[PDB]
Enzyme design. Sequence first.
Site, short mmCIF file in Angstrom:
data_model
loop_
_atom_site.label_atom_id
_atom_site.label_comp_id
_atom_site.label_asym_id
_atom_site.label_seq_id
_atom_site.Cartn_x
_atom_site.Cartn_y
_atom_site.Cartn_z
N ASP A 181 32.38 80.57 41.16
CA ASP A 181 31.94 79.84 39.96
C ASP A 181 31.39 80.79 38.90
OD1 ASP A 181 32.61 77.20 40.86
OD2 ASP A 181 30.55 76.50 40.78
N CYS A 215 44.15 78.61 33.76
CA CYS A 215 42.83 78.42 34.34
C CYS A 215 42.17 77.31 33.54
CB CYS A 215 42.08 79.76 34.37
SG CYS A 215 42.12 80.72 32.78
N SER A 216 40.90 77.41 33.14
CA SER A 216 40.39 76.35 32.27
C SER A 216 40.81 76.56 30.81
CB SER A 216 38.87 76.22 32.39
OG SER A 216 38.47 75.01 31.72
N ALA A 217 40.53 77.73 30.23
CA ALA A 217 40.97 78.01 28.85
C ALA A 217 42.32 78.72 28.75
CB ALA A 217 39.92 78.86 28.11
N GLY A 218 42.82 79.27 29.84
CA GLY A 218 44.08 79.99 29.83
C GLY A 218 44.02 81.39 29.20
N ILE A 219 42.88 82.08 29.27
CA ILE A 219 42.77 83.43 28.71
C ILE A 219 42.05 84.42 29.62
CG2 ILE A 219 42.95 82.62 26.33
CD1 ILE A 219 39.91 82.95 25.99
N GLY A 220 41.13 83.95 30.46
CA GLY A 220 40.34 84.86 31.29
C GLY A 220 40.95 85.25 32.63
N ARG A 221 40.76 84.42 33.66
CA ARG A 221 41.50 84.60 34.93
C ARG A 221 43.01 84.70 34.71
NH1 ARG A 221 38.17 79.88 38.23
NH2 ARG A 221 36.11 80.55 37.47
N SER A 222 43.56 83.86 33.83
CA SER A 222 45.00 83.89 33.55
C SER A 222 45.43 85.25 33.00
CB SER A 222 45.36 82.79 32.55
OG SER A 222 45.25 81.49 33.11
N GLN A 262 38.05 87.86 29.27
CA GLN A 262 36.93 87.24 28.54
C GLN A 262 35.60 87.98 28.66
OE1 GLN A 262 37.55 83.16 30.40
NE2 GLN A 262 36.93 82.49 28.37
#
Length: 282
Positions: A181, A215-222, A262
Amino acid sequence: MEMEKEFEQIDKSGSWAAIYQDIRHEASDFPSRVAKLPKNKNRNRYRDVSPFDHSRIKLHQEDNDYINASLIKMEEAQRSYILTQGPLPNTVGHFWEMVWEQKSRGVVMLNRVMEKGSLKCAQYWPQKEEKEMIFEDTNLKLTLISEDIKSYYTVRQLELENLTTQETREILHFHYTTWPDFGVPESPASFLNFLFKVRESGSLSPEHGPVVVHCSAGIGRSGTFCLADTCLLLMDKRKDPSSVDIKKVLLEMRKFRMGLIQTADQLRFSYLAVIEGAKFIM
Ligand SMILES: CSc1nnc(NC(=O)c2ccco2)s1
């Protein structure tokens, strides 16, 4: 500089925040006018994360062709990816329309539906074989065929049917379930194992449309997923693998979607993943 020793030099000097801020300063800025039209407000999860106009995915619709999704096209590596936000209650039908129209084989999900006590994306696939989903706005049907639950990730086989033509296709859902998390994983080993499972399935290969990753925003983990994949592929292709410059690859990817990676901790984790991954390949 090489990667592994540039890495220890940033650790010893404690300058990850300064390196990451340099990337943010040099990153491309292109218009995202379609994303900001008033009619699209309920199609965006976050007001500060939008697809550039020049690289956005268009839905094959004449009413409204907008989805928060970008085509990342890596020319030297010969890989393409679609990076998108986690679907919203009013965009689950658009999401599967995109998968269909772009001929994707695989969907890569890097978040849980609920994290930190809040919803991070809609429950957009069926959880029981006998309870299929119908998306009436885009005329698609989605059925769960099988599910394999492992300790760090789950793989699902799904059937997507275009109800207009009665054509069907098999879609593979690769769900990484153990990203914490807060922060990043301590070791990249399970993330790399997951990446190799996606590769082995064929979902990243040229005989299919681009993989859809979110992912949630599509920029960090993605962003971490596609950055690691592309860097490892370039290390296999080039005569001199130590020439691969992860900061330069990241800036190239940021020509196609804003904000990839991010935090400075995500940048450090990406270095760690590529470094460890390059030893296993050989
Ligand atoms: C359990 S039977 C059934 N439930 N719901 C269906 N359709 C959808 O859930 C849907 C469309 C967009 C978001 O959810 S078929």
